[PDB]
Amino acid sequence: STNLKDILADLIPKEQARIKTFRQQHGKTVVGQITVDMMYGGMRGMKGLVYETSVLDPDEGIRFRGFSIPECQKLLPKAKGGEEPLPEGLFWLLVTGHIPTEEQVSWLSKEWAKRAALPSHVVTMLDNFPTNLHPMSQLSAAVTALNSESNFARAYAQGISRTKYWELIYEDSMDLIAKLPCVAAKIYRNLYREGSGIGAIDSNLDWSHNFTNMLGYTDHQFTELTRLYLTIHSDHEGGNVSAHTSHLVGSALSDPYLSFAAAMNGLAGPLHGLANQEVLVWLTQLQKEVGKDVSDEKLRDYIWNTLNSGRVVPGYGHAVLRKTDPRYTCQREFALKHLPNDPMFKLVAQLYKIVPNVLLEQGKAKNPWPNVDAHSGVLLQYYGMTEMNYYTVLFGVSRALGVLAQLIWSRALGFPLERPKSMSTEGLMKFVDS
Amino acid sequence: STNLKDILADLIPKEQARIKTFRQQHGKTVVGQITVDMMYGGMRGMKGLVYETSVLDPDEGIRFRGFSIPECQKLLPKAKGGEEPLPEGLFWLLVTGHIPTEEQVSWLSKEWAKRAALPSHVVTMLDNFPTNLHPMSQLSAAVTALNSESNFARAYAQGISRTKYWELIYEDSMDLIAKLPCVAAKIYRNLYREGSGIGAIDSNLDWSHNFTNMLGYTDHQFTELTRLYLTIHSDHEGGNVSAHTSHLVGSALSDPYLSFAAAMNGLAGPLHGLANQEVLVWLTQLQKEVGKDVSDEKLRDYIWNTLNSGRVVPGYGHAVLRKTDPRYTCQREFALKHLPNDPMFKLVAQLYKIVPNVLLEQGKAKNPWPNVDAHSGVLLQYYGMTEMNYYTVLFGVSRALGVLAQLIWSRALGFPLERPKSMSTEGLMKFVDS
Ligand SMILES: CC(C)(COP(=O)(O)OP(=O)(O)OC[C@H]1O[C@@H](n2cnc3c(N)ncnc32)[C@H](O)[C@@H]1OP(=O)(O)O)[C@@H](O)C(=O)NCCC(=O)NCCS
Ligand SMILES: CC(C)(COP(=O)(O)OP(=O)(O)OC[C@H]1O[C@@H](n2cnc3c(N)ncnc32)[C@H](O)[C@@H]1OP(=O)(O)O)[C@@H](O)C(=O)NCCC(=O)NCCS
Ligand SMILES: O=C([O-])CC(=O)C(=O)O
Ligand SMILES: O=C([O-])CC(=O)C(=O)O
Numbered sequence: 001s002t003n004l005k006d007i008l009a010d011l012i013p014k015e016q017a018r019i020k021t022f023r024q025q026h027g028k029t030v031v032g033q034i035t036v037d038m039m040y041g042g043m044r045g046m047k048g049l050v051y052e053t054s055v056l057d058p059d060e061g062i063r064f065r066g067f068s069i070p071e072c073q074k075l076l077p078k079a080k081g082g083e084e085p086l087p088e089g090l091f092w093l094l095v096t097g098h099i100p101t102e103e104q105v106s107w108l109s110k111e112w113a114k115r116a117a118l119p120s121h122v123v124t125m126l127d128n129f130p131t132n133l134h135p136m137s138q139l140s141a142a143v144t145a146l147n148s149e150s151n152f153a154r155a156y157a158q159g160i161s162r163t164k165y166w167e168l169i170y171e172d173s174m175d176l177i178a179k180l181p182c183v184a185a186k187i188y189r190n191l192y193r194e195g196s197g198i199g200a201i202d203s204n205l206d207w208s209h210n211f212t213n214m215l216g217y218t219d220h221q222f223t224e225l226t227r228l229y230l231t232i233h234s235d236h237e238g239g240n241v242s243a244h245t246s247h248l249v250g251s252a253l254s255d256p257y258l259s260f261a262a263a264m265n266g267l268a269g270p271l272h273g274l275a276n277q278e279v280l281v282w283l284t285q286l287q288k289e290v291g292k293d294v295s296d297e298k299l300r301d302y303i304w305n306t307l308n309s310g311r312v313v314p315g316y317g318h319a320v321l322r323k324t325d326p327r328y329t330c331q332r333e334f335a336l337k338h339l340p341n342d343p344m345f346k347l348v349a350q351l352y353k354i355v356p357n358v359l360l361e362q363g364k365a366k367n368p369w370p371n372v373d374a375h376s377g378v379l380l381q382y383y384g385m386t387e388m389n390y391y392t393v394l395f396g397v398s399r400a401l402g403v404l405a406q407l408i409w410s411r412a413l414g415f416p417l418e419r420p421k422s423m424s425t426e427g428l429m430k431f432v433d434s
Numbered sequence: 435s436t437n438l439k440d441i442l443a444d445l446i447p448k449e450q451a452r453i454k455t456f457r458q459q460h461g462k463t464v465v466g467q468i469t470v471d472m473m474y475g476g477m478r479g480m481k482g483l484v485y486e487t488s489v490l491d492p493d494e495g496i497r498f499r500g501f502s503i504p505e506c507q508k509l510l511p512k513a514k515g516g517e518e519p520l521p522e523g524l525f526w527l528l529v530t531g532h533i534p535t536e537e538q539v540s541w542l543s544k545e546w547a548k549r550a551a552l553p554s555h556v557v558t559m560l561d562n563f564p565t566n567l568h569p570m571s572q573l574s575a576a577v578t579a580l581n582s583e584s585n586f587a588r589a590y591a592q593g594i595s596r597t598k599y600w601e602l603i604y605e606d607s608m609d610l611i612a613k614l615p616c617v618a619a620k621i622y623r624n625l626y627r628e629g630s631g632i633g634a635i636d637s638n639l640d641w642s643h644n645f646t647n648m649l650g651y652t653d654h655q656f657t658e659l660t661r662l663y664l665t666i667h668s669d670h671e672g673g674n675v676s677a678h679t680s681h682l683v684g685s686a687l688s689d690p691y692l693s694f695a696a697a698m699n700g701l702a703g704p705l706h707g708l709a710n711q712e713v714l715v716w717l718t719q720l721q722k723e724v725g726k727d728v729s730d731e732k733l734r735d736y737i738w739n740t741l742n743s744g745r746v747v748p749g750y751g752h753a754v755l756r757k758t759d760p761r762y763t764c765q766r767e768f769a770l771k772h773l774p775n776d777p778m779f780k781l782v783a784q785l786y787k788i789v790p791n792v793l794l795e796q797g798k799a800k801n802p803w804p805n806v807d808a809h810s811g812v813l814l815q816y817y818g819m820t821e822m823n824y825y826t827v828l829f830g831v832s833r834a835l836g837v838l839a840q841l842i843w844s845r846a847l848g849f850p851l852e853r854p855k856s857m858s859t860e861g862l863m864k865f866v867d868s
Contacts, residue, residue: 018859022862042849049856051858134582137578137579148568244854251705252703253705270687272851273686319853416475424487
């Protein structure tokens with residue numbers, strides 16, 4: 001009905017059987033080869049893990065359990081008075097493989113609202129943190145400290161049956177998702193709103209709304225952006241560092257709290273979670289260098305400079321995707337309707353016309369189109385979320401959705417300890433010579 | 435000379451060139467195949483990554499840059515008045531590939547002693563933590579909060595050259611290793627010594643000694659055990675979850691602090707870091723069930739019960755190793771000389787005679803010999819380290835050695851973002867049908 005845990009109880013045995021069958025038939029089917037470059041090249045191209053919740057076609061971008069962003073935009077339930085998809089509904093999709101109903105979504109909003117309370121020790125911890133401790137550091141430490149609340153960790157050590165793992169994981173994952181906005185907003189307020197309180201969860205507001213309230217914003221459209229934001233950042237295959245980290249750490253039977261916090265430390269990495277910031281920085285430098293308002297051909301010549309000087313035009317390209325990110329388009333649409341005359345956006349809008357035209361000519365590229373990160377920055381800034389250091393906190397709150405959805409399934413399906421084999425260069429050399 | 439950073443400056447270009455050469459020749463050499471079972475089976479058997487510091491021959495156990503535990507026991511410098519190898523020397527080995535000199539070791543002791551101070555905010559954090567927050571949770575959160583001290587994170591965001599990455603990483607790794615005992619001991623004292631202070635670093639004592647002092651022990655032989663302990667837990671290939679996690683998170687250019695803390699959350703997992711505890715628990719239950727003193731044939735029959743009832747005799751077997759763990763033998767030797775009449779040990783000693791004899795007959799096994807975890811427990815208990823929840827803190831303090839040694843080399847060699855490809859079951863099915 002509306003009880004997700006019950007629907008999950010239904011789905012799991014079917015998937016387990018489907019998997020076991022496939023492994024009996026095709027377990028020894030070679031699905032690719034491992035080269036020396038793949039070992040040195042951070043496993044690039046190597047099919048390495050099964051992750052069920054989302055799949056990225058390098059052609060049309062990301063699909064959540066079969067559905068594209070555009071479909072999600074239309075099918076997923078919206079806020080009462082909204083036109084953006086509730087991330088609750090997206091969680092539901094990743095977990096069940098089914099588009100939810102308004103009732104299902106509403107039920108999930110209430111569930112998360114019921115579970116959202118922080119333990120005192122985590123409030124103390126956040127409240128005592130200095131202002132120079134990075135937001136993501138605060139987040140990761142806080143979530144680690146939450147592991148005191150873990151069902152799974154307690155029950156595991158009592159000797160619960162493997163079959164029951166997923167159930168504990170679900171409860172913890174549900175608890176964690178509920179608390180994350182609280183954590184995230186306590187960080188925001190401690191850092192930028194002089195330690196004021198987050199205030200109260202409204203039991204009748206959606207997750208994204210209770211969030212933006214706790215962050216101390218009130219503008220309708222910032223809450224709609226957030227809804228979009230949290231939806232579209234939620235998942236991106238299992239190969240990305242935050243996903244994979246979560247998966248790897250979970251594989252050792254570390255609870256969702258420890259699994260998520262590990263993931264956040266990977267999300268904190270410049271090469272994964274910071275591109276938003278780097279775009280916004282680069283743009284600000286662009287406007288400083290050749291001016292805030294510009295003709296297309298002027299804009300064009302600046303581009304080449306960045307390149308030939310040994311610098312990446314940021315927000316463009318991707319490790320695997322090979323076309324304009326649905327997650328960009330998504331945001332563009334949001335900005336063709338809600339701030340078409342915002343100047344930073346106009347510039348974002350302009351680079352979409354010029355950057356692609358060049359870049360390919362530079363050769364070194366593969367992916368000549370914008371990624372999600374090219375666009376998120378100006379939207380956040382526009383509503384007064386100007387604190388760039390904080391922006392990955394948003395991303396993480398979102399990415400909890402996908403990686404916890406998967407973590408449940410990973411435990412449900414009994415995936416084992418991730419434990420690839422390493423080789424030293426020397427050993428790898430003595431291997432190939434043989 | 436004694437300045438490790440200088441020797442590292444020397445070694446790196448040589449290794450870079452050796453690697454580049456090998457990649458030019460053999461980059462496309464297939465070194466194995468990926469099956470469907472490897473994707474579902476947590477990458478088991480799949481050569482996936484290059485990790486230089488240690489290699490595990492499934493036959494003779496672990497080698498540190500070419501040397502076995504027995505060699506390390508003889509070659510590595512010892513404390514002045516010691517017979518156990520200083521883990522400083524082991525760090526030196528993993529970093530340089532060279533057995534160090536007493537002078538090199540002494541220099542490293544002094545370096546770590548100089549860098550050991552904790553920032554106030556981390557002391558506040560530890561000092562405010564409740565007693566029910568797991569030691570490993572405390573550790574991981576503390577190390578995350580240390581990232582405020584990161585050289586690498588600050589310099590990265592200023593736009594330092596890739597070539598300089600390793601240098602920053604080395605400084606951070608050196609700082610972190612130095613602070614870890616302080617963190618670890620502050621946790622120990624807060625939890626078990628009523629919040630007493632850790633006291634002072636002696637600038638003329640080795641790392642292991644300054645540790646056991648801060649932990650509030652004084653017995654010579656506990657400090658010698660610790661020296662052995664920290665040495666032999668230090669590294670175990672890059673495939674183990676803590677190593678790999680560190681490697682994965684580092685690959686995103688997260689600083690050593692974030693990389694290590696992520697690793698600790700994986701080490702916290704029952705399937706990686708808890709076997710020590712599970713052994714000690716199982717043993718205590720064994721003595722409760724059939725008595726504290728026992729004949730060999732009695733002991734023998736109990737074993738079968740554990741098995742046939744659907745339970746693992748813990749401390750025996752390993753994901754990859756296939757013989758008596760050097761890390762066990764190591765400890766046995768330490769207990770054939772320092773507590774041969776300790777009863778818990780006698781029992782450990784007795785199971786080494788009976789368990790192997792059976793187990794294989796159970797079939798399900800592959801690895802019928804003891805791992806390191808079968809032995810560490812009774813040694814720690816013997817000197818009054820009876821707090822089992824804390825034992826993984828020790829393991830982590832040790833494992834920092836190997837995974838930071840590697841993290842330096844990973845940055846030195848310019849290893850890229852780890853980013854394997856995932857597939858859903860459904861996608862994997864539509865792949866094989868094609
Ligand atoms: C995302 C990104 C890292 C993917 O690159 P990759 O998969 O590692 O590598 P590529 O296949 O693009 O490498 C081909 C070349 O194109 C370059 N390149 C890729 N995108 C580029 C861009 N937008 N501007 C300039 N050069 C670019 C790479 O630096 C590389 O140059 P090289 O051959 O001299 O090393 C890259 O597009 C980039 O740096 N973009 C900016 C950062 C960003 O937007 N990140 C967010 C996604 S996580
Ligand atoms: C370490 C360990 C997990 C490795 O097992 P693995 O590589 O996952 O799997 P194996 O190749 O041993 O699996 C073969 C069978 O032997 C069993 N097995 C392995 N060691 C065993 C032991 N000491 N006692 C009983 N059964 C054992 C496994 O449970 C498995 O049974 P199954 O076929 O019914 O599933 C396993 O030896 C174990 O559980 N030991 C105790 C825990 C421990 O000491 N861990 C520390 C190392 S991280
Ligand atoms: O997919 C990637 O590697 C890029 C990304 O950060 C994500 O969306 O998670
Ligand atoms: O090698 C493994 O997987 C077991 C272990 O925990 C280690 O020593 O790190």
